[PDB]
Design an enzyme around this catalytic site. Structure first.
Site, short mmCIF file in Angstrom:
data_model
loop_
_atom_site.label_atom_id
_atom_site.label_comp_id
_atom_site.label_asym_id
_atom_site.label_seq_id
_atom_site.Cartn_x
_atom_site.Cartn_y
_atom_site.Cartn_z
N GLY A 146 0.92 -1.18 0.02
CA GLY A 146 -0.40 0.29 0.15
C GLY A 146 0.79 1.35 -0.08
O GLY A 146 0.67 2.28 0.10
N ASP A 171 -8.07 6.94 2.06
CA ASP A 171 -7.02 7.80 2.84
C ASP A 171 -6.16 8.69 1.55
O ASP A 171 -6.34 8.11 0.90
CB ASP A 171 -6.04 5.98 2.91
CG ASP A 171 -5.38 5.60 1.63
OD1 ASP A 171 -4.46 5.25 2.03
OD2 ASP A 171 -5.89 5.56 0.71
N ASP A 172 -5.76 9.47 1.91
CA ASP A 172 -4.74 10.63 1.86
C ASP A 172 -5.80 11.36 0.16
O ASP A 172 -5.37 11.63 -0.12
CB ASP A 172 -3.97 10.36 0.93
CG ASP A 172 -2.32 9.42 1.76
OD1 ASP A 172 -2.05 8.68 2.16
OD2 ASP A 172 -2.78 9.86 3.44
N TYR A 186 -7.17 8.30 9.70
CA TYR A 186 -7.03 6.52 9.50
C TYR A 186 -6.19 6.41 10.78
O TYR A 186 -5.14 5.01 11.39
CB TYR A 186 -6.36 5.91 8.68
CG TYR A 186 -5.31 6.84 8.03
CD1 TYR A 186 -4.08 6.82 8.15
CD2 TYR A 186 -5.63 7.37 6.76
CE1 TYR A 186 -2.97 7.16 7.60
CE2 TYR A 186 -4.42 8.47 6.16
CZ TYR A 186 -2.99 8.17 6.00
OH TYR A 186 -2.17 8.15 5.64
N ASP A 220 8.53 4.79 1.90
CA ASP A 220 8.36 6.51 0.40
C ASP A 220 8.16 7.15 1.27
O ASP A 220 8.10 7.94 -0.17
CB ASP A 220 6.69 5.47 -0.40
CG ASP A 220 5.35 5.84 0.57
OD1 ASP A 220 4.51 5.63 -0.11
OD2 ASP A 220 5.31 5.54 2.36
N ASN A 229 2.47 -2.73 6.17
CA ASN A 229 2.63 -1.76 4.91
C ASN A 229 4.55 -1.36 5.03
O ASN A 229 4.94 -0.73 5.70
CB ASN A 229 1.94 -0.42 4.33
CG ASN A 229 1.89 0.65 3.31
OD1 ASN A 229 2.50 -0.38 2.19
ND2 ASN A 229 1.96 1.56 3.42
C1 LIG Z 1 -4.31 3.71 5.91
C2 LIG Z 1 -2.46 4.63 5.50
O1 LIG Z 1 -1.95 4.31 6.27
N1 LIG Z 1 -2.22 5.14 4.13
C3 LIG Z 1 -0.93 5.42 3.50
N2 LIG Z 1 -1.04 4.73 2.32
C4 LIG Z 1 0.63 4.88 1.81
F1 LIG Z 1 0.93 5.21 0.61
C5 LIG Z 1 1.46 5.00 2.91
C6 LIG Z 1 3.19 5.08 2.43
N3 LIG Z 1 3.32 6.11 2.89
C7 LIG Z 1 3.17 7.62 2.38
C8 LIG Z 1 3.45 8.51 2.23
C9 LIG Z 1 3.59 9.55 3.32
O2 LIG Z 1 4.38 10.21 3.83
C10 LIG Z 1 4.08 11.58 3.98
C11 LIG Z 1 5.00 12.60 4.19
N4 LIG Z 1 5.41 13.05 5.04
O3 LIG Z 1 7.29 13.82 5.50
C12 LIG Z 1 7.06 13.38 3.62
C13 LIG Z 1 7.91 14.25 2.71
N5 LIG Z 1 5.82 12.45 2.90
C14 LIG Z 1 4.20 8.62 4.51
C15 LIG Z 1 3.04 7.03 4.26
C16 LIG Z 1 4.02 5.71 5.44
S1 LIG Z 1 0.36 4.42 4.42
#
Ligand SMILES: CC(=O)Nc1nc(F)c(CN2CC[C@H](OCc3noc(C)n3)C[C@@H]2C)s1
Ligand SMILES: CC(=O)Nc1nc(F)c(CN2CC[C@H](OCc3noc(C)n3)C[C@@H]2C)s1
Lengths: 450, 451
Positions: free
Chosen positions: B10, B117-118, B162, B228, B256
């Site tokens: 994810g 999410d997001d 979330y 990521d 994840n």
């Molecule tokens: C429900 C839920 O948790 N959905 C998620 N979707 C993705 F794609 C995830 C992975 N990544 C996505 C990127 C996030 O970065 C935010 C960020 N903070 O500073 C910078 C630069 N990017 C961190 C997060 C860990 S977690």
């Protein structure tokens, strides 16, 4: 007249996957190319453990892979590299090599190759007692395999001395190539990379030179777009340094391209253009065609309803800029070469702004900042495009150039503000240095930058 | 009692390939884990173009993928993210979402997920006229899909809020979560990442807090090993900050992990250890087990005959060192934390060598240089082992640590020479800076390093 044109997967690095290879076969067919040489250095059973049989899982994959080549009318050639630890004089080693190729043949493979590239020239005592030379040993086993496999229509041999610079004492007088030309069965093809491992140009005269001693027209194993010798290099430039005049002097051309699959669009597209050029080929015209065709691969509500997801799309100019930044092993593209020159000049002449010379500096500085912005424009548009597959195969390269260029634009701007400011320029104050993540970033921040 | 334990693909970044996912299913089964949530942010048809049907080629791959999950007794869950541009109030948008999940169902998929999410919290005017809130819109369509798909045994919902920090004004008083808990059908699971997106710890009290307002035990979507958000960070450390006391208070845990597949051995192995711990788990003991098991994945002629190809093998110590350098989001591993401290100290106290203090400096400098050598040694043994590809996944990180480390060793050596030699230390004179390839390297050399 049969001519082998296509791709050799023959690099060190992560081998390509099923999905990618199937895509490669679709592309080769549509571009009227016909060959695929299977030689990944890091398939542990192709080289390092050439003796080991493929597992049941590996077998199903090879069968699928070979069926896909047949489906798209691509000749699949299975290569084996036993040279690191084979005892040529041992009958048990010879039947193991036969056992291994019978396995792959049972997967539906009809064409084969024996590679002897990048190995120690020194034979064991047991082999010395049986063969006059290293070349004798190789030719002996290569002829035995070729005949044992019922003399296949397509069978290749890669010599230990596979380019000009690897020939002892030279190409024309090599005793190794002399033996190869005299004793290697006429039906077997000889792979050659030109004057060097990565040849800037493959001159017609060099092909005549080698063809005389090997007593046949070779198949070029081309390393023009290979990049496994530098983790920070990518070649998106056109096929260059090989006249179409080589085509009647050759049995084929097999390109060994970049590790990153999606970066090989131009490399393979331009080679196909060169092959079908009717003895009239232009790298610049070919690059334009390839870039135009590549661009295709990059691609309802009411007024009170939610607007559909939309991104500012990637342009031909973005691709021209990208190919110019990641061009060829011996040359940057015009736009990249120009940017470098501009930066060199501005940095060397920064003293004039610390009358017509001041005008020149400011004018070139303004043009450079626009050039820098265009690199950022390109990055942004690529990073927000529809094709994630293409993007993530090159992302690190693009991200890296984008990062270095924003520090370069900052520095050039700082050099401009010097007459009105006494503020200091610090690399430590720059985001790529300061906001660098991981343990490595913590150490790097403690290094004496400035 | 069904408990979903496994992996969520994810993240943003290059999605995993068929070969990798099949390998993941083999590993999950052998480690007694049972679930796989398919949610790659960059599968263009999962999120960005959620409306578009999968092509014939894409269809064959999904069928193969789903058959592989069934073969290794792993529950395959297909997730869809329509939240960026869906008009919830439009009947045509609802049947498109149904059309898309019927396609994937026709590939043999039995379990599903709707992720929100997001995404921007602000609804379109057409949606505002139909739903009291954003939560109302989501729950409405989620309940419709769940029931339309004949109420599947495994159906998940990922809320826009979330994690603790994403709850407005807080977890206990969120009107969004209030609607979720009240209107979301009981049979639907709710994904939760704990107090933060990347939670250092998931305290039992925080799960009680959220379970009350969502009116159910959640499924943790764990971002402990995710990378990521940073191009230069990688996490090979053990599952940490989650008590086994959470297990009877959860419907499951879906990790994840890192974008690089082969870098998720420890992440998934330690989670399996945690899941099967029988309420007694140690991150250090778990890390040791994982590392020992991972070492297996890295693995006659006559006297006058040619000796068989042999490589100096990778050691457990090399793995311990590697994991310590690329550990956890909130902590470096002991060996990495130690090296940093040593470098900080040596740099801060370099003036003593510009009596017992001089002895201390020279002694600590010598120990540091050995530590630096061990890092190169590790790098070298990993690049020459039988399984080169594990390192091909991690190359950018190992190369970067090796490179900074060599420059740091040089700097420390230069500092210890300041009493004799008059020579200046230049970053430009260092091999990682000077011998840097590509056009980017040419530009970098022209940057004012050393003023
Ligand atoms: C429900 C839920 O948790 N959905 C998620 N979707 C993705 F794609 C995830 C992975 N990544 C996505 C990127 C996030 O970065 C935010 C960020 N903070 O500073 C910078 C630069 N990017 C961190 C997060 C860990 S977690
Ligand atoms: C017959 C034939 O060409 N056999 C090959 N095998 C592999 F693996 C190749 C790819 N890589 C391997 C690494 C080489 O690095 C050394 C080097 N030589 O010049 C330059 C430049 N780097 C470059 C070379 C291009 S080419």
């Amino acid at each position: 007249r049969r001519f082998l044109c296509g791709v050799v997967e023959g690099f060190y690095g992560r081998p390509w996957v099923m999905e990618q290879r199937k895509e490669l076969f679709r592309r080769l067919q549509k571009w009227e190319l016909n060959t695929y040489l299977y030689a990944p250095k890091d398939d542990y059973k192709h080289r390092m453990f050439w003796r080991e049989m493929y597992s049941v899982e590996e077998a199903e994959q090879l069968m699928t892979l070979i069926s896909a080549a047949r489906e798209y009318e691509i000749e699949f050639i299975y290569a084996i590299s036993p040279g690191l630890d084979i005892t040529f004089s041992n009958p048990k080693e010879v039947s193991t090599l036969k056992r291994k190729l019978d396995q792959v043949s049972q997967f539906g493979c009809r064409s084969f190759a024996l590679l002897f590239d990048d190995i120690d020239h020194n034979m064991c005592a047991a082999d010395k007692e049986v063969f006059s030379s290293f070349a004798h040993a190789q030719v002996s086993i290569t002829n035995e395999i070729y005949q044992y496999l019922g003399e296949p229509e397509t069978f290749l041999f890669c010599p230990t001395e596979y380019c000009g610079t690897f020939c002892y004492p030279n190409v024309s007088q090599s005793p190794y190539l002399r033996t190869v030309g005299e004793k290697l069965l006429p039906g077997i093809e000889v792979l050659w990379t030109g004057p060097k491992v990565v040849s800037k140009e493959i001159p017609v005269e060099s092909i005549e030179e080698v063809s005389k001693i090997i007593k046949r027209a070779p198949v070029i194993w081309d390393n023009i777009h290979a990049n496994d010798y530098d983790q920070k290099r990518l070649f998106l430039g056109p096929y260059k340094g090989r006249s179409t005049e080589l085509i009647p002097r050759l049995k084929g051309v097999l390109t060994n391209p970049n590790c990153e699959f999606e970066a090989n669009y131009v490399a393979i597209h331009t080679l196909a253009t060169w092959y079908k050029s009717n003895m009239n080929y232009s790298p610049q015209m070919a690059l334009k065609l390839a870039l135009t065709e590549w661009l295709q691969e990059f691609g309802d509500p009411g007024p009170n309803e939610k607007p559909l997801y939309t991104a500012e799309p990637v342009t031909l100019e973005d691709l021209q800029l990208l190919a110019d930044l990641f061009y060829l092993p011996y040359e940057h593209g015009p736009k990249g070469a120009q940017m470098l020159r501009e930066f060199q000049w501005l940095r060397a002449n920064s003293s004039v702004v610390s009358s017509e010379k001041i005008e020149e500096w400011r004018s070139r500085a303004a043009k450079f900042e626009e050039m820098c912005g265009l690199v950022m424009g390109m990055f942004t548009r690529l990073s927000n495009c529809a094709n994630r597959t293409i993007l993530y195969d090159m992302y690190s390269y693009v991200w890296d150039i984008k990062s270095i260029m924003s520090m370069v634009k900052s520095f050039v701007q700082w050099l401009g503000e010097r007459s009105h400011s006494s503020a200091q320029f610090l690399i430590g104050d720059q985001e790529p240095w300061a906001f660098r993540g991981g343990l490595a970033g913590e150490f790097q921040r403690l290094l004496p930058i400035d």
